[PDB]
Amino acid sequence: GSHSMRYFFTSVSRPGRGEPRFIAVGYVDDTQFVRFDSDAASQRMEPRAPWIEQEGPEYWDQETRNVKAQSQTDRVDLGTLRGYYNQSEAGSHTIQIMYGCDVGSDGRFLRGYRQDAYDGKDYIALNEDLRSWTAADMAAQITKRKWEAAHEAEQLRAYLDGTCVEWLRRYLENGKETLQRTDPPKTHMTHHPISDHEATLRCWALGFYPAEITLTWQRDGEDQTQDTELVETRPAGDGTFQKWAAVVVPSGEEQRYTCHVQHEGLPKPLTLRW
Amino acid sequence: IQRTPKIQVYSRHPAENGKSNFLNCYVSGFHPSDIEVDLLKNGERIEKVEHSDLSFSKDWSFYLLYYTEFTPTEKDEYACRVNHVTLSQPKIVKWDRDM
Amino acid sequence: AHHGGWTTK
């Protein structure tokens, strides 16, 4: 199947309490493999997956210096964007960055991306063609003109459709024993009366990987939609994920409801009935 | 600008009294990132509690996993206490093994 | 490996 490598950056200013908090995390698919925390003691990029530990001393020196330089860049941008949006020095603000690349099962490049945010809202993003930018407002347009004149897109593209793909292929090979796995969800249903006349039917999906999954309820073929409680997909803590969906049904009519499970690790979508 | 965290309290494996397990508290969908999360046993804070590194979803909202190893007994009560700028008082979500 | 290129905003 397809795979992705993604890096996530968060810088949160804290005026009067020192330098901004900086946290960087790298992922291959849904598996974290590196991290950096400005408040941690090591002040180094640290391994978080077994297959990345074999990288040599130069790798960890290079990743530590480059991730520190990204934090210093966010430090300047936090004050610059503070002036763009006419905000005071007293408040805490956040810059978030995500970029990465996707490859196919044969390793071919599929797409690259980079998106930046300010205070949890879109700021600037690279377009699909990896040649132009889309600013979210007139303030971010100032950054766009600055990045256009500096030809930042051409530099970033050479990473996103080149260097990013090169490292993702190597990581997928080095961690083939754990990154090429697909665990199908274990499915079951539970029944919880809420009164003498109604009961909750909860449809469970446990121990699946990757996190992408679909749970839907259905009543006599007619889809249920807004009468369903759907919780966010959650990590089990061991590398797998969990999710459930519930619906309140009248007592005695449980046979009219069906749960439908969709996951790439399943040959055919499952249909459960109490 | 600010979004309140969604809190889920659950165990890694199906609960069974007497057997060691892992107690999870998953907070997601919140902004800003500053948050205080504690795991409670009979109302008292648990000391040895780890958490994942801060990351965010496509809508830029943050998510965190707090976890510790525990042995669930039918007498002990477990919960997750979350404080956030969007909350007027810390939210306590009890652990229900049916959820 | 992540990208080692930056331009301030």
Residue numbers in the entry:
A (entry chain A): 1 to 274
B (entry chain B): 1 to 99
C (entry chain C): 1 to 9
Please quote the paper that reports this structure.
Deconvolution of the MS/MS spectrum from HLA-A*03:01+/PIK3CA (H1047L)+ cells divulged a single Mut-containing peptide with the His→Leu substitution occurring at the second position (P2) (ALHGGWTTK; pMut). Mechanistically, immunogenicity to this public NeoAg arises from enhanced neopeptide/HLA complex stability caused by a preferred HLA anchor substitution.
We crystallized and determined the X-ray structures of the pMut and pWT peptides bound to HLA-A*03:01 at resolutions of 2.0 Å and 2.1 Å, respectively. The pMut and pWT adopt nearly identical conformations when bound by HLA-A*03:01 (root mean square deviation = 0.72 Å). Together with the P4/P5 Gly residues, this results in a largely ‘featureless’ central peptide region dominated by the peptide’s backbone. The overall similarities of the two complexes suggest that structural differences alone likely cannot explain the immunogenic potential of the PIK3CA public NeoAg. Consistent with the introduction of an optimal P2 anchor, we discovered that the melting temperature (Tm) of the pMut/HLA-I complex was significantly higher than the pWT/HLA-I complex (P < 0.0001). At 37 °C, the pMut/HLA-I complex had a significantly longer t1/2 compared to pWT (t1/2 = 5.497 hours ± 0.130 versus 0.078 hours ± 0.001). Co-culture of Mut PIK3CA-specific T cells with HLA-A*03:01+ target cells pulsed with pMut confirmed that this sequence, but not its WT counterpart (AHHGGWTTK; pWT), triggered T cell function.
